[PDB]
């Protein structure tokens, strides 16, 4: 049932109690690692897409 709280809501409570403002800092530190990887994959796929178009 939707009354049951989701894991993200339980983690939200945990975060609030254990680190209200340091969560944003951890989001920033982890973001630096995620976006660089996803942008690398974005640029490789985009090159692949242009290449496949050219091969067409």
């Amino acid at each position: 049932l939707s009354s049951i709280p989701t894991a993200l809501t339980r983690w939200t409570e945990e975060c609030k109690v254990l680190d209200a403002e340091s969560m944003h800092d951890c989001v920033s530190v982890v973001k630096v690692s995620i976006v660089n990887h996803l942008e690398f994959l974005r640029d490789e796929e985009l090159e692949e897409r242009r290449e496949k178009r050219r091969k067409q």
Binding site: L38, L41, E45, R50
Partner: protein, 61 residues
């Protein structure tokens, strides 16, 4: 995966030049799409986690 917006215009000299300008621009809209689901197997539950779960079930009775 960051989403790919459609090929704006066929043609590499101009359209793809400004499609890299758009997608890779300092100011851009990196929307997200998920990858297709990879077939995760169930993690085996440790025995201590089963002496924690079983002790609550015994507290039912």
């Amino acid at each position: 995966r960051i989403a790919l917006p459609a090929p704006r215009g066929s043609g590499t000299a101009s359209d793809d030049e400004f499609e890299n300008l758009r997608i890779k621009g300092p100011n851009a809209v990196q929307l997200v799409k998920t990858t297709p689901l990879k077939p995760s197997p169930l993690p085996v539950i440790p025995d201590t986690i089963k002496e924690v779960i079983y002790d609550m079930l015994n507290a039912l009775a």
